[PDB]
């Protein structure tokens, strides 16, 4: 019943591969559906064409900022920001899908794939997903990355929907 949403990656332009989300409906339903939705583009907005724009190997990938392309922007499906569902999930290894935020119940629609773990940000990031297939996509997004985060190539979504 959870549901499993689909990015295909590409590098300058040409494809890398598929990666694929489980979404924990049933342990956080507002913060999943706010990902899935804009995965869909359903509402009219959502995440195909935008990039990852910082992307910190043995860290992390960062993206979902299609309105400002450089961590500052993004909105939710709710409004421009929403709250911390709650902190059930934790940041237990590589492949959990956590939202980025600017504080306490600031939820809009930036992301971020561990490519660690990372437990330190327990109880302050609310945990929504997990990569089902593809992890060794992202491991190859990493490479692109930087220690300061920079990409040295552009890294986009370049297609994104609900497989089930």
């Given at each position: 019943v959870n549901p499993t949403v689909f990015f295909d990656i590409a590098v300058d332009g040409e494809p890398l591969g598929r990666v694929s989300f489980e979404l924990f409906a049933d342990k956080v339903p507002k913060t999943a559906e706010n990902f899935r939705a804009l995965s869909t583009?359903?509402?009219?907005?959502?995440?195909?064409?935008?990039?990852?724009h910082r992307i910190i190997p043995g860290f992390m990938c960062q993206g979902?900022?299609?309105?400002?392309?450089?961590?500052?922007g993004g909105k939710s499906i709710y409004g421009e920001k929403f709250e911390d569902?709650?902190?059930?999930?934790?940041?237990?290894?590589?492949?959990i899908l956590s939202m980025a935020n600017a504080?306490?119940?600031?939820?809009?629609?930036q992301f971020f794939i561990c490519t660690?773990?990372?437990?330190?940000?327990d109880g302050k990031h609310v945990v929504f997903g997990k990569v089902k297939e593809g992890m060794n996509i992202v491991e190859a997004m990493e490479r692109f990355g930087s220690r300061n985060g920079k990409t040295s190539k552009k890294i986009t979504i370049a297609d994104c929907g609900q497989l089930e």
């Open positions: 583009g359903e509402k009219g907005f959502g995440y195909k064409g935008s990039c990852f979902g900022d299609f309105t400002r392309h450089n961590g500052t569902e709650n902190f059930i999930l934790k940041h237990t290894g590589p492949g504080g306490p119940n600031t939820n809009g629609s660690a773990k990372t437990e330190w940000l």
